[PDB]
Structure formats: structure tokens, C-alpha cells
Design a binder for this molecule. Sequence first.
Ligand SMILES: O=C1CC(Cl)=C(Cl)C[C@H]1O
Ligand SMILES: O=C1CC(Cl)=C(Cl)C[C@H]1O
Ligand SMILES: [Ca+2]
Ligand SMILES: [Ca+2]
Ligand SMILES: [Ca+2]
Ligand SMILES: [Ca+2]
Ligand SMILES: [Ca+2]
Ligand SMILES: [Ca+2]
Ligand SMILES: [Fe+3]
Ligand SMILES: [Fe+3]
Lengths: 308, 310
Amino acid sequence: VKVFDTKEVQDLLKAAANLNGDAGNARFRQIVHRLLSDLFKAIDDLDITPDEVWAGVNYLNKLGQDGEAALLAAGIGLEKYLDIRMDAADRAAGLDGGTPRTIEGPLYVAGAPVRDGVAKIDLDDDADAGPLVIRGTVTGTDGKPLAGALVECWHANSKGFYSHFDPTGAQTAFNLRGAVRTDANGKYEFRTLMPVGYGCPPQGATQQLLNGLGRHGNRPAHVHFFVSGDGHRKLTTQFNIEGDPLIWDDFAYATREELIPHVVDKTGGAALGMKSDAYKEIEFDIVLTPLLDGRDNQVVHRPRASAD
Amino acid sequence: SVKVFDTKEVQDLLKAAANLNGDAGNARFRQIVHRLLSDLFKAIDDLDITPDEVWAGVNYLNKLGQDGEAALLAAGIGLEKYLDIRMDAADRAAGLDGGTPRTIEGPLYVAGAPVRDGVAKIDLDDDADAGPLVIRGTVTGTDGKPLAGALVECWHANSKGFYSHFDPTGAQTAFNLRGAVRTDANGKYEFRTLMPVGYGCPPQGATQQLLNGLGRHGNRPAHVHFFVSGDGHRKLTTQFNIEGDPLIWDDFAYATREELIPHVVDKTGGAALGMKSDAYKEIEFDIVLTPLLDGRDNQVVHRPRASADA
Ligand SMILES: O=C1CC(Cl)=C(Cl)C[C@H]1O
Ligand SMILES: O=C1CC(Cl)=C(Cl)C[C@H]1O
Ligand SMILES: [Ca+2]
Ligand SMILES: [Ca+2]
Ligand SMILES: [Ca+2]
Ligand SMILES: [Ca+2]
Ligand SMILES: [Ca+2]
Ligand SMILES: [Ca+2]
Ligand SMILES: [Fe+3]
Ligand SMILES: [Fe+3]
């Protein structure tokens, strides 16, 4: 049967969204009416059964009980889609030359201590991860180095786990998480260990949905960044570790070809405080976009974990 | 505002995310996911929904599930009623619209209540503020003949608006105000209970947070829930509302039906029936069940339901 176009259904949608209500949050009512209307039409069009609907309702309970709604947002492409719309806006405005954005993901932790120029961020021993230096120069789109810019990174350990989100046991606070203010020449450096990519929690709601679609829930090895500086927009980006077999099969659709730097083998590690003489080095330079009339039209406010 | 939805990049992303071009799998599930995601992406594009707005919605979904309230929200934004509208329309088209009208189940059924023959007393806990109530009727098929041994199940709230197994102020006795009766040889059932009071959504929970955002209340009028089943017939999900409740036509779950507001009668003689006062109220609520078409019930609903041991 098809009922969506009937007066009874359209009146129910108007009442459920309180479109005819006293002055209120008009924007919220507009969004709720649109999403509810679309859901009702999809149920009608695809003949979605009550059993199927209640299975979707039950899934929403599990999704939130697991705390995984933002992980699902990445896994079904919604987080990438937000980047697509931001990129389209920048393109229409004539912007080029900045380091490409990519997704934040759900695992930022606020409050990491800020160091000048260089930070050692591996606080916990990890025998299976080799030492890694990440270094680079931050500039603006005019090519000039940005001094005092804030470069933040976070990444996983050799088991694919992040501090504050490790199910096998608590890591030291801010393990593999750090913030550096660039030096006078725009330079930043992190001394860390090499990340390994991971999968979604195997019994969690995100992987349950992915299993139902026939999809894996894995990401290639990567390092996250936030980069900010006076006169410039905040950049959310990442880089992928070259050579990872999942680099073009990320379940969160986040890989970009300009964000895959070369990995160089180096010696002299002990004088840098690394745990072995031989280590890997990645040079990741970063270009920030200036503000427009003092405004950052793309910084994102969302719930984020914190720690002391 | 940009418009990207109808670009190859976005359509390719939707196909990958729902795995449309994947190896053999659950095509139906992939079809539903692709449709829901596509509509969501189009709505974000059409209404210029900002990342901050999207992450607030994602955060709400986390709170909804953490509260265990997705089924309460399904009732509150009309989705549960909408499923009834579609079932009613299918019944009308098939000629299976001759029985007592359906209405929503709601999320508070509990399996395992004790069953009695003919008559059941289901108020196990005292409730000084609720007066005694007899609910009785006859179960027939659409041809009018009584159905013997049909199962009539009842559940409802106490005077504070709380159900057993879902009372936040303290545990009720298992299956307080929950019972089942097997009809007698002439189709009769009777419940002896206490009068329910209507209630509201948990005030701090996700459902009321969203309703507050819309400017709506989260209250229901007083009512009694029923399942009725019997061999050879479809399972009926229905309710009745208590006459005179001011919320009767302003139910936050849109479940009231004019056919399901029975006359309440004042009676005396309660003590002889095991009621706590001489005066009591009686509601007659007859049930007409539809015979199975082709031996199968194609409107019965399987959903997660609580259960308990008596
Ligand atoms: O750190 C990460 C963990 C998860 Cl689940 C996503 Cl979705 C992104 C990735 O960067
Ligand atoms: O028992 C009830 C409680 C809630 Cl929340 C709904 Cl939605 C329906 C009503 O029958
Ligand atoms: Ca340029
Ligand atoms: Ca240490
Ligand atoms: Ca450990
Ligand atoms: Ca549409
Ligand atoms: Ca008693
Ligand atoms: Ca007794
Ligand atoms: Fe990550
Ligand atoms: Fe109820």
C-alpha cells in the first residue's frame, strides 16, 4: 500500500514536528520535519515492514549504548560527505594551494601539553612499534613560514589502539598525543612510534552494520592533525603511512593522494632520544589557508573527549 | 550554499558505503541503507545542514541509545502510529478490516505473566490512590461466534503512571498490573485491577529533550494495553483510553481512536469480588478477531520485548 501522500499522514508529520506550534526553534522543527518525512516516504516506497523498522530502532539503542554513533558517521561516509561539501565551498570561493582537509574521526582528546618546537609523545613502551620522527614546516598559501602555529597530532599504537580508548587497559594519559608550537622558521617535530591501522570494535554496533553490508571496518595506518595559527583557518587533516595495503580501501573513505608522504630510513636515533639508532622519518609540510575577513567559515564544534 | 548531492563523487560514495557493487550479500539491507543514507545526504545538501548541526544530531543518537529510548522516540514522533496507518491501509485493501481496531503497542510489554482461566486479578501491589476497576468482555470472530480459549493479555500503569519492570522509584512486584486470561467456553474474559493514570516520558531522557526542542509535551492519557490471540485468528494489538481524560485527544504518541474509548460504569458490590471498596468502576471491552487469511498472520509484529520470571 501507498499512504504517504494522504492527508492523515501529512497531518501526522506536521503535528509530530509541531510546525503549527507557538513560536519556537523553527530551524529545528524544519530539520525534524524533513528527516521524518523522508523516513516515512522511504518506508512507504520500499515497503519497509514493522519488523524491519523495530530492528532499526533496536539498532539505534545498541549504537548509543556502545557510544558509537560518530564511528558509524565515519563508516557510512557521512563524515567524508561533510568534507566534500566544505571542499566544494572552498573551490567555489577560488581557494587552492592549502593542504587538503580530511576527516577528524571520533578519537581526539583535548588537553595535551604544548611544547615548543619538538615533543616526544610516546609515553608507553610498545615493543612491536619502531621509532618514528614526524617533522615539517607550516606555511601560509603565500609561502611564508608561520611561527608560533599550533600543530597537534594523535595516532594509534601497534595494536591499533589510542590512549583514552584502549579496551585492553588504560594507557598513560596522552600517550601518542601531542601539541607543538612551531619555531621561528615554521618548524615542528614529533618523536613517536609508528602507528598501525585498526578495526572497529568487532562486537560493536558499527561493525554489526558493516557486517550486514558485507564490508570490513578497518583503516590503514595514519596520523591525525589539527593545525592552527593567527590569521589562518584551522586545518583538520591526516597522513597515511605509505605502502599500507588498505590505503585505498579505508572504511571511512578518508585517503587523499596528497596526504601520503615518503618514509625515509635514518640513523642517529639515540642522540634524538629514540629507542634505537635506526628509525623512520616522515617530512610532512603543511600549508594553511588565511582567514576571510577575520572569519573561519569551516571550523567544526563537536563533542570531544578531554583529559588532564 | 553549495549543492553537491548529484555529483559523481557523492553518488559513488553512497554506492560504496552501502556496498551496492559488492559480492553477493544482503541485497535488501543494502537497498534500505542506500536509500536512507541518500535521503540523509540530500537533506543535508538541501537544507545546508552544517557540520556543527550534524555532530549535534550524532551526539543525540548516542544519548538516545544510552538512555535506551529509541522505541519511546519512535512513538513520540509518530513512527509507531505510522506503521499502524500502513497496516490499516493494507487491511482495507484486503478486506481484513472487520475486527476491533488496532493501535500501538508501545515499548512496555513484558512476557511471562501468569495466565488464568476466565478471570484474573492483576493488582499485586497496593496503590492507595487508585480505585478498583473491572475490565471484562467477550471475544468473538468477525462472524460473531465466541472464541473459547483465546488469550487476552493486559498491561497498564499504576496511579503514579509507572509500569512494573519499568518503575524508576522502586521495584514493583513482578507482573503487577500485567495479566493474561484464557477465555471461557463462551468467549468471556475478566480482569480485576486498579484504575491507571497517564504519564509522561522520563523528563531528563532523550525523547523529552527532543520534544522540548520542538515545543511539545511528552504525556499520554490513561489507558490499558491489550494483546488478543487465538487459534485460527490474527493477533490483535490494541488499547483503550479511560473516558474523560483531558489528554485523550492530545496524546504525544498519537494512539487514540474514537472506537477505543469505552463507557465507564459505576458499580457497587466490590467486596464480594475481592475489591478493596464497595464502589468500583467497570469497563466492558469486547474484542472481534479476524480469521487468518491463508493460514498465516501477516500483520503480527516481532520486536525486542522484555521478559521476566513470575
Ligand atoms: O582513529 C580512528 C578511529 C575511527 Cl573508528 C575512525 Cl572512524 C577514524 C579513525 O581515524
Ligand atoms: O506505556 C506507554 C509509554 C510510552 Cl513511552 C509509550 Cl510510547 C506508549 C505508552 O503506551
Ligand atoms: Ca591560489
Ligand atoms: Ca615512558
Ligand atoms: Ca597496555
Ligand atoms: Ca526525496
Ligand atoms: Ca493488594
Ligand atoms: Ca484473591
Ligand atoms: Fe585514527
Ligand atoms: Fe502505556
